[PDB]
Amino acid sequence: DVNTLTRFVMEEGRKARGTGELTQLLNSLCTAVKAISSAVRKAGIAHLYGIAGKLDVLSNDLVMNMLKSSFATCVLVSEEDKHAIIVEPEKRGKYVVCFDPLDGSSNIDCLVSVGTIFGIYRKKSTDEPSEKDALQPGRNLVAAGYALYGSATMLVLAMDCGVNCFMLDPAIGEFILVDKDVKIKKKGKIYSLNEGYAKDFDPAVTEYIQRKKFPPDNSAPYGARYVGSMVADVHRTLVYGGIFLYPANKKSPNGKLRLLYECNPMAYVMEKAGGMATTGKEAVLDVIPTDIHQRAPVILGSPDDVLEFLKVYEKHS
Amino acid sequence: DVNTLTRFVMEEGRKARGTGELTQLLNSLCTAVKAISSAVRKAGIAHLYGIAGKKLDVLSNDLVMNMLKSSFATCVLVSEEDKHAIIVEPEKRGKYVVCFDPLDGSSNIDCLVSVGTIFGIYRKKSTDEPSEKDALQPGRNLVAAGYALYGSATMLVLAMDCGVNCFMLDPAIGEFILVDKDVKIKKKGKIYSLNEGYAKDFDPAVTEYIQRKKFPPDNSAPYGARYVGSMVADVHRTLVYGGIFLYPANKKSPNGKLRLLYECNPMAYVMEKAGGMATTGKEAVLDVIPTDIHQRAPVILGSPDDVLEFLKVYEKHS
Amino acid sequence: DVNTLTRFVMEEGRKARGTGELTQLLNSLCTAVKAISSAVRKAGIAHLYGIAGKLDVLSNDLVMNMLKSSFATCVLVSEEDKHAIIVEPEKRGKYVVCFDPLDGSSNIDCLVSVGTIFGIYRKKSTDEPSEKDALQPGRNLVAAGYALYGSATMLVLAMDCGVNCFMLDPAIGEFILVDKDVKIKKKGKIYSLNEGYAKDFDPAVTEYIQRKKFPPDNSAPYGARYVGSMVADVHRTLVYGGIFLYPANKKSPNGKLRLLYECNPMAYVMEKAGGMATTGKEAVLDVIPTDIHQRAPVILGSPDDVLEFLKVYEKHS
Amino acid sequence: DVNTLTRFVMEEGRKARGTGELTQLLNSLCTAVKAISSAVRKAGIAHLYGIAGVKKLDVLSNDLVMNMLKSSFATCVLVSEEDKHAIIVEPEKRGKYVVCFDPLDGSSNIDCLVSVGTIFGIYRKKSTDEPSEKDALQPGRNLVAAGYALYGSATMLVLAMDCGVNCFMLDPAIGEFILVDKDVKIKKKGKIYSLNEGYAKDFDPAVTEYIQRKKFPPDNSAPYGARYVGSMVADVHRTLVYGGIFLYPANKKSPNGKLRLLYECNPMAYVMEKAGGMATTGKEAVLDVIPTDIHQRAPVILGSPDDVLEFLKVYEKHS
Ligand SMILES: CC(C)Cc1sc(N)nc1-c1ccc(P(=O)(O)O)o1
Ligand SMILES: CC(C)Cc1sc(N)nc1-c1ccc(P(=O)(O)O)o1
Ligand SMILES: CC(C)Cc1sc(N)nc1-c1ccc(P(=O)(O)O)o1
Ligand SMILES: CC(C)Cc1sc(N)nc1-c1ccc(P(=O)(O)O)o1
């Protein structure tokens, strides 16, 4: 039987005997993602070029407005906003949402794949809503995932029931369920990181990557891929297996990627798919944040690959 | 004034006092590219999944093949998808030879990586009965070439003698809008692009050049690395941002990996028309005289100062 | 604040403390309607004409399959099917749906507006579901409405809370709420019927139309409009006011339109909009059907216009 | 073999050994029509209703056609239903063609989602004078091309030229007009009549008598069916596809009719005649009227020839 994201979300909410608030949140996010996709694919660009005589900001506006009007949220943290956004009293629900509305858009001028990343938390205290409600470890996530605006548009949604992938059919604006309860390969054959900054690598990263290129045994060297857009690289890791790295170094002891709306959602998807996600020192999902924009190192993907990295990392610890 | 690809192609044909045959070819190709984009973005996939109770690379080849055949402008067609050249039936023959990759990068379409269509257009040069040999011309001889990138948005890059022009597909109206005119690549970039998984097989010249990008001998900032693994995506980035793209020979691909006729030559033509460079290491890509329609070539291309720097390192290793 | 069909249907179900079954029904119908619209606008027609080297049937298949897979229905009545469809036991819910999947499609060859009409009943009994469960008067409707595939695509949905109109934004495949709690004009200035049957008209119809052309109170004559597609003509009646008539004639002595999936849903929309719908002898919604494809005469629209027709009708007994 | 509007127009221009100017005109119009279709179907309406936290369609449509035709470099004089005076194209963009068009016909009733359309007629400038409004004052029989786009259940472009009438369906998945009906001809006699019978009290006696013959046939035949969408493009297209007759005649209150000669009557009359149909004012062929004002009105009775001819017999019977 055919299944849509709308039908899937609703049925999961009915199974859980929810009140319907999270379902409305998720319906609203889905509508925003379709609107971002339409804009990313440049529908209407002819009018900008005068036929009748901003993208990251627009994407942030779509998600903010759709989530606010769901009546399901109370605190919203965006890559694009300096402070947490507090929902007006009359529209407050119980959920906290952290999101990157257009990840990878810094290089959107070359039409590289971009994406939307989100993580949904339940507000934990009855206090007046504030940034502190967003300072939860990723292990508290209720749902998380991403939309990839690639060759096609796909929404990957992870919850307690596992990871499910929905393809956007732009003819009818419906996300069609195409991959159910997806699991990552135990060991991959691809490594992904920016090797241009090798002179800054921690010695452990240098040694691990050298082992991927010059394997000590009779195995084939891994292939390399680095799109430079986190959603594209993490999605490829999910589909094909392997390892994605944005690790710490001495000039960046906490990494570069942001914990709340990049690392934690992707770490959550990975673990629900049977993968792993580490800072080197601990699981990404166990980090307790103190700053809504704080950075975290991240190494994620197939467990045998992540564990091999940790073996090398501890050798230099 | 707004300009569409349709209007742009027609006016170039008018200025050249052509008979309209090449205009019909390019209009047919534009229609095929829009149909491929729609399919690549999965329009109608719900029907495939049972909403009412071909492979993408094969469909794309069928779209390009049929639109070019029915243009009456072509006589010989070479596709990545076909072992032998397709010879157009006599009554539909025109004078052009088209080599193309209808869905470049589609081997990894399962992870929704950017894919593209690459094409190069030659005039038939021989007066013989049309055959596979008519596609064996050096890239030197191209009349027009370019690619469609099905990335975050769909763009067509078209190169001819008048230069390189970039058109964005507006999917609301199915129209290619001219958005970047007479494009030129940066003289020198800050990004290098290659699969470093083959580091163990690199010739010394490639190894040293990449070492220079990571550890600059002059203490400037290291280049950033990018490698999508889809040639159209990596080359388009090289065009837009500058830098260098490399697919050199390795042990699995001793003649290189990329295909000369419908990957290297079109991209090399776009690059040179944009003020860039494209070399095999030994010679300009466009000077290679092919002997086989699916033959491979090593390729190093992008900003002129970056390729020239590579070539100096190459000469240092004889 | 923006509102979608998805969000509106979900919120009405929450206010009603429903189990979510009707919501799944309506979302499934929403998906089918977008797919029908896509096909009606001829998306993909180039593939039929050889670019790479039935509509009424497809429309029925879309509605049938989406409703079956909702797990919300037990009996399905379509204009396209001789007998009622009984849903298999594992997919049964409690709702009975009568629909015309592509109303007006007989003239789709001239690109006239066409539509989808639907009416939803609740099955209350523990008997095994059968065709007889669809033999209900329209006053039993839980929800009803129509999708119009006209110059744009609009879904009109009627329930106890009133009538609401949703515009399909095809860039994102989302129905946008654009007209809330719609009420029809008390009196219009347009009458709609096929005057080609003037020779067969009952004396009451003839006299009523004479009053529209030569007004007894010295008012200006009504304008005439007859698209010949029931959904187009009735939607215009809703938006602009006035009257729509399909009375008995010699080829159709019980009228021509179908009671179950044409007259009843439109009569329901009209009454929920403050309008009226009569057979001449009684309200459409009070007719007790004996055959799922039985026909009925219908006069519907603005209340003053229908009441005026009924005055003429009562004059002729 | 599949054929698109772009390819068909280009090949017709090649067959005629044209310079390509008319081809550029038509490509530009095709682009405008796709943009109108997109807006008519309400793409992006979610943004107007606040999804991220403005012109009426008839104005946008006029702006689209005006700008696309200007930038074709193929036109010199433009007449629109929306503009009191003809637009004279600035010198650097001038071509030889005169275009009269209605950018969104029937749009006054667009609020009920009734079918709407675009109508156009293309002339060559005949005078050696500086271009002016007078260059649009040509009889319809001078038309080089004419036709219409109907934004109905699907969007179709009907294009008439000397080679006949051809119908192209817009495939919105790819923005291509697909040739679906070639060298169209209308039925010799139909079974539908189309006019606003609510104003029967104002009818001319000939019209009254003719419509009476359709409802109460004297020859024991079946009465005609009635259809009246109230959008000219929709009613005329149905007349082309199914046959029959469409009427907006002159009456006692409107001695010149209501529809506009230059950009409503002439193009539809031209399409009709190229399809083997007829189009008359009652007194003469629409295509023979020589206009004196670009917004002048004309009565129109058009469609299947046996029906128009029957109408004219009744009309002449009443002198
Ligand atoms: C395990 C999953 C996340 C449960 C789901 S899945 C969905 N659509 N809704 C819920 C849910 C539970 C409670 C509530 P609520 O009372 O806050 O709405 O919703
Ligand atoms: C420099 C460019 C390639 C010239 C162009 S650009 C276009 N649309 N057509 C032509 C062209 C020249 C000759 C012919 P033809 O007589 O084969 O048709 O066409
Ligand atoms: C008055 C309106 C129609 C009530 C609505 S509105 C909506 N979306 N659902 C319902 C509803 C009631 C009962 C059930 P259920 O337990 O069969 O699902 O649903
Ligand atoms: C009979 C038809 C109208 C001929 C056609 S059909 C088309 N696409 N162009 C032309 C045409 C003739 C002259 C010119 P021009 O030199 O003004 O461009 O064009």
From TrEMBL, chains A, C:
Cofactor needs: Mg(2+)
Residue sites binding AMP per the record: V9, T19, G20, E21, L22, T23, K94, Y95
Domain of life: Eukaryota
Enzyme class, broadest EC rank: hydrolase
Annotated residues for binding of Mg(2+) 1: E79, D100, L102
Reactions listed under catalytic activity: beta-D-fructose 1,6-bisphosphate + H2O = beta-D-fructose 6-phosphate + phosphate
Enzyme Commission number: 3.1.3.11
Residue intervals of the Fructose-1-6-bisphosphatase class 1 C-terminal domain: 184-313
Binding-site positions, beta-D-fructose 1,6-bisphosphate: D103, G104, S105, N194, Y197, R225, Y226, M230, Y246, K256, R258
Biological-process GO terms, alphabetical: gluconeogenesis
Binding site for Mg(2+) 2: E79, D100, D103, E262
GO molecular-function terms, A-Z: fructose 1,6-bisphosphate 1-phosphatase activity; metal ion binding; nucleotide binding
Pathway in which the depicted protein is active: Carbohydrate biosynthesis; gluconeogenesis
CDD domains to which the protein is assigned, alphabetical: FBPase
Keyword tags: Acetylation, Allosteric enzyme, Carbohydrate metabolism, Gluconeogenesis, Hydrolase, Magnesium, Metal-binding, Nucleotide-binding, Phosphoprotein
Domain (Fructose-1-6-bisphosphatase class I N-terminal) ranges: 4-179
Subunit comment: Homotetramer.
Record function comment: Catalyzes the hydrolysis of fructose 1,6-bisphosphate to fructose 6-phosphate in the presence of divalent cations, acting as a rate-limiting enzyme in gluconeogenesis. Plays a role in regulating glucose sensing and insulin secretion of pancreatic beta-cells. Appears to modulate glycerol gluconeogenesis in liver. Important regulator of appetite and adiposity; increased expression of the protein in liver after nutrient excess increases circulating satiety hormones and reduces appetite-stimulating neuropeptides and thus seems to provide a feedback mechanism to limit weight gain.
Annotated family: Belongs to the FBPase class 1 family.
Name of the protein this chain belongs to: Fructose-1,6-bisphosphatase 1
Species for this entry: Homo sapiens
Gene name, Swiss-Prot/TrEMBL: FBP1
UniProtKB/TrEMBL annotation, chain B:
InterPro entries on file: FBPase_C_dom (IPR044015), FBPase_class-1 (IPR000146), FBPase_N (IPR033391), FBPtase (IPR028343), Fructose_bisphosphatase_AS (IPR020548)
Positions with a binding annotation for beta-D-fructose 1,6-bisphosphate: D104, G105, S106, N195, Y198, R226, Y227, M231, Y247, K257, R259
EC id: 3.1.3.11
UniProt-annotated binding residues for Mg(2+) 1: E80, D101, L103
Coiled-coil boundaries: none
Keywords for the protein's UniProt record, in alphabetical order: Acetylation, Allosteric enzyme, Carbohydrate metabolism, Gluconeogenesis, Hydrolase, Magnesium, Metal-binding, Nucleotide-binding, Phosphoprotein
Binding site for Mg(2+) 2: E80, D101, D104, E263
Pathway: Carbohydrate biosynthesis; gluconeogenesis
Residue ranges of every copy of the Fructose-1-6-bisphosphatase class I N-terminal domain listed in the record: 4-180
Cofactor list: Mg(2+)
SUPFAM superfamilies tied to this protein: Carbohydrate phosphatase
One GO term (biological process): gluconeogenesis
Domain Fructose-1-6-bisphosphatase class 1 C-terminal: 185-314
Residues engaged in binding AMP: V9, T19, G20, E21, L22, T23, K95, Y96
GO molecular function: fructose 1,6-bisphosphate 1-phosphatase activity; metal ion binding; nucleotide binding
Catalytic activity: beta-D-fructose 1,6-bisphosphate + H2O = beta-D-fructose 6-phosphate + phosphate
Superkingdom of origin: Eukaryota
Family as reported in the entry's similarity comment: Belongs to the FBPase class 1 family.
NCBIfam families to which the protein is assigned, alphabetical: PRK09293.1-1 (NF006778)
Functional note: Catalyzes the hydrolysis of fructose 1,6-bisphosphate to fructose 6-phosphate in the presence of divalent cations, acting as a rate-limiting enzyme in gluconeogenesis. Plays a role in regulating glucose sensing and insulin secretion of pancreatic beta-cells. Appears to modulate glycerol gluconeogenesis in liver. Important regulator of appetite and adiposity; increased expression of the protein in liver after nutrient excess increases circulating satiety hormones and reduces appetite-stimulating neuropeptides and thus seems to provide a feedback mechanism to limit weight gain.
HAMAP family tied to this protein: FBPase_class1
Subunit structure of this chain's protein: Homotetramer.
Protein name listed in UniProt: Fructose-1,6-bisphosphatase 1
Gene: FBP1
